RNA sequence: GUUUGUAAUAAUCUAGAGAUUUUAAGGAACUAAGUACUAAUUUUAUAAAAAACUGAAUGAUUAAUAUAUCUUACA
């Protein structure tokens, strides 16, 4: 037999051309309430696909980048260095260096 | 409280060195309790750098994409 399975995903198509429009009007109506997680669970999709059909307005996106930047300034020199190492190992991996 | 011991003044007595009384007097390094009388008392004194890796469980938020082309829209 073959060795154990580690990653065998299954693609699904649960959204229709009409439901895609509902995802667009909702995301633009209230991006705070109709988050991508809420729309993902509502239409039984992946959080990525929700982002492939529509994007939040530029105003809602800037506050997301700020929220992640404010939590980053709370890191000390020891945690900020470990975070940067984790981001470099990933880039090095895809360059064939790891 | 404890300790030392009956200060001075005054009264009386005394050859006079002294005695008696006021007198358990007057003191005191010490102990205990109480008391803010003195000192803890000058305008952001100093030091302290501060959340690793992998697996598992379980959340939040988000383009967390690519290819073709050079024009597109407005006025
Ligand atoms: Mg005694
Ligand atoms: Mg860690």
UniProtKB/Swiss-Prot annotation:
Q: What disulfide bonds does the UniProt entry report for this chain?
A: none
Location in the cell: Mitochondrion
**Subunit composition and interactions:** Component of the mitochondrial large ribosomal subunit (mt-LSU). Mature N.crassa 74S mitochondrial ribosomes consist of a small (37S) and a large (54S) subunit. The 37S small subunit contains a 16S ribosomal RNA (16S mt-rRNA) and 32 different proteins. The 54S large subunit contains a 23S rRNA (23S mt-rRNA) and 42 different proteins.
The record's similarity note reads: Belongs to the mitochondrion-specific ribosomal protein mL58 family.
What this protein is reported to do is described as: Component of the mitochondrial ribosome (mitoribosome), a dedicated translation machinery responsible for the synthesis of mitochondrial genome-encoded proteins, including at least some of the essential transmembrane subunits of the mitochondrial respiratory chain. The mitoribosomes are attached to the mitochondrial inner membrane and translation products are cotranslationally integrated into the membrane.
**What is the name listed in the Swiss-Prot or TrEMBL entry for this protein?**
Large ribosomal subunit protein mL58
The species this protein was found in: Neurospora crassa (strain ATCC 24698 / 74-OR23-1A / CBS 708.71 / DSM 1257 / FGSC 987)
